[PDB]
Structure 1
Amino acid sequence: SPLERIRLFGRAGLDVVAALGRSTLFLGHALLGRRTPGTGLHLLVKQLYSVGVLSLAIIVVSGLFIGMVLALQGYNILISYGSEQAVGQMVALTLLRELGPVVTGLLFAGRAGSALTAEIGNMKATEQLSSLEMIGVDPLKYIVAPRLWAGFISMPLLAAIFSVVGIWGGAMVAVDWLGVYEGSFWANMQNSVQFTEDVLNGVIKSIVFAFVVTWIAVYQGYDCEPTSEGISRATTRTVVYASLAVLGLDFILTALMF
């Protein structure tokens, strides 16, 4: 029925409505609820390991490849303009103000934005997440608070590591394989950086959709209905949305500052 079809559409409207409402409530309860008995900092260490460190080889190799691609594209894009040696101010400006954090999102939100949702989803599905209450610990502070903290304090560091490896790979292909001159590269690069105005720009950009990624990437895991199909669908909702939001907030955050 078309009228009831639109009824279902509107029900989905109110559904995402109440969804992110409940999400912000969840986030509040998690970051500022109380202090639980069985918490600490070792939790944060274990998480930060599972979320950042394990997801580090991926972004290292990905930074390598995307950097040398950025080079092999800039060299050939610009040799048609003579200003070949200026490739440094490209491979280090695009890889540092916009593409750096965007790809770092789409990868972090790819792996650690998912195997983080499936983790606390599975937890909810084997009731493990529930027996915590019957014990007495608040899960939203023992199970998910270290997730959020491993998010906020990993993805920015990951973006930095990615940008570094990207620039270095771009140089290594440009210097050794393209043949452009050694010192000229870093020279034009440092002459065209504007630290507080591009580097810090990219870092605040990284942090904001670090927060946004590992916010949904954990909420979805907390909300998914407990069944092996439910989790299998939540760990896809949290890639759809974690990429949508990465790019959307990249766009807004770059309209705030060109």
Structure 2
Amino acid sequence: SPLERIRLFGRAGLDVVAALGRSTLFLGHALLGRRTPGTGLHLLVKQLYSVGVLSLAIIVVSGLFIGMVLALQGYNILISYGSEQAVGQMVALTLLRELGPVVTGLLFAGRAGSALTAEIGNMKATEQLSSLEMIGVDPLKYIVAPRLWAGFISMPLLAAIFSVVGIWGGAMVAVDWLGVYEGSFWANMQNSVQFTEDVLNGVIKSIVFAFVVTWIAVYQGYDCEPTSEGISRATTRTVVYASLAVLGLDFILTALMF
């Protein structure tokens, strides 16, 4: 009935807020709650290799591909406007202030946002997390806390690597394939980057969405329902939500610095 559908809609509405506040409390208890006995830097390293180092081939190959795409494309668009030697700054503007970090947030929400929700969500279904509180180790600090720190300090690094490989691949297709003058690429590139509005801009834009990408990826797993299908629905909710919180948050972050 309509009165049933609207009640279900309002319930889903208020529940979405309830979850958005529960996630904030969860992030609080995870990041600055206490210091449980089982913690250390070995956890952060073990999680840094599973969240970043494992996600290295995907984003590197993707950055190479997207760079040879942006160059192979803008050259075709620049060949009509005469700004031919201006394709270098393009693969370093359309890949270093908005698309670099955005595509890195899309691939890091997909690989290490779905592989971090199906790994921290499958631990909840097999009682791997519940068997930690009964040992005495707060799972928010032993399991969730390292994953939150290996997302914060790996997605900006992955975005920088993404931008570097994309720029270099754009060079390798502009210069070696499309035959634009070699030195002009990097020259025209570096005179018009304006570090404080390109490099640091994209890096803050990557820290922002990257932090969000590993907060709504480590919470959706922690608050999934403990079943083989609850995990598989959470690992999809965390790709949807972490793609929206990459794109829309990139709009909110680019409206502040164009």
2:122–2:231 contact (8 Å) kept in structure 1? yes
SS of the residue 1:42 aligns to = helix
Q: Are residue 98 (structure 1) and residue 89 (structure 2) matched?
A: no
SS of the residue 2:29 aligns to = helix
CA deviations on 1:16-75 (whole Å, 9 max, x unpaired) are: 010001000000000111100111110000000001000000000000000000011011
2:151–2:214 contact (8 Å) kept in structure 1? yes
Greater helix content:
1
Q: CA deviation at 1:206?
A: 0.2
Q: 2-side partners of 1:186 and 1:139: how far apart?
A: 48
What percentage of residue pairs aligned between the two structures are identical? 100
Q: CA deviation at 1:2?
A: 0.2
| Mean CA deviation greater in 101-110 or 78-87 | 78-87
Gaps spanning 5+ residues in structure 2: where? none
Q: 2-side partners of 1:240 and 1:34: how far apart?
A: 31
Q: 2-side partners of 1:35 and 1:42: how far apart?
A: 15
Q: 1-side partners of 2:26 and 2:194: how far apart?
A: 39
SS of the residue 1:96 aligns to = coil
Residue of structure 2 in register with 1:206 after alignment:
206
Runs of 4+ off more than 6 Å: none
CA deviations on 1:139-168 (whole Å, 9 max, x unpaired) are: 000000000000000000000000000000
SS of the residue 1:34 aligns to = coil
2:85–2:181 contact (8 Å) kept in structure 1? yes
2:59–2:104 contact (8 Å) kept in structure 1? yes
2:48–2:154 contact (8 Å) kept in structure 1? yes
CA deviations on 1:173-212 (whole Å, 9 max, x unpaired) are: 0001100011111110011100112110000000001110
2:197–2:257 contact (8 Å) kept in structure 1? no
Q: CA deviation at 1:119?
A: 0.3
Q: 1-side partners of 2:163 and 2:215: how far apart?
A: 23
Residue of structure 1 in register with 2:222 after alignment:
222
Q: CA deviation at 1:6?
A: 0.2
Q: CA deviation at 1:107?
A: 0.2
CA deviations on 1:87-122 (whole Å, 9 max, x unpaired) are: 111111110000000000000001000100000110
Q: CA deviation at 1:133?
A: 0.8
Residue of structure 2 in register with 1:148 after alignment:
148
SS of the residue 2:193 aligns to = coil
Scaled by the length of structure 1, what TM-score is found?
0.99
Q: 2-side partners of 1:26 and 1:83: how far apart?
A: 51
Q: 2-side partners of 1:246 and 1:191: how far apart?
A: 29
Q: CA deviation at 1:4?
A: 1.2
Aligned length: 258
Q: 2-side partners of 1:91 and 1:255: how far apart?
A: 21
Q: 2-side partners of 1:48 and 1:122: how far apart?
A: 19
CA deviations on 1:66-85 (whole Å, 9 max, x unpaired) are: 00000110110010011111
Q: CA deviation at 1:128?
A: 1.0
CA deviations on 1:208-233 (whole Å, 9 max, x unpaired) are: 01110000000000000100010010
Q: 1-side partners of 2:120 and 2:82: how far apart?
A: 54
Scaled by the length of structure 2, what TM-score is found?
0.99
2:91–2:170 contact (8 Å) kept in structure 1? yes
Q: 2-side partners of 1:135 and 1:122: how far apart?
A: 19
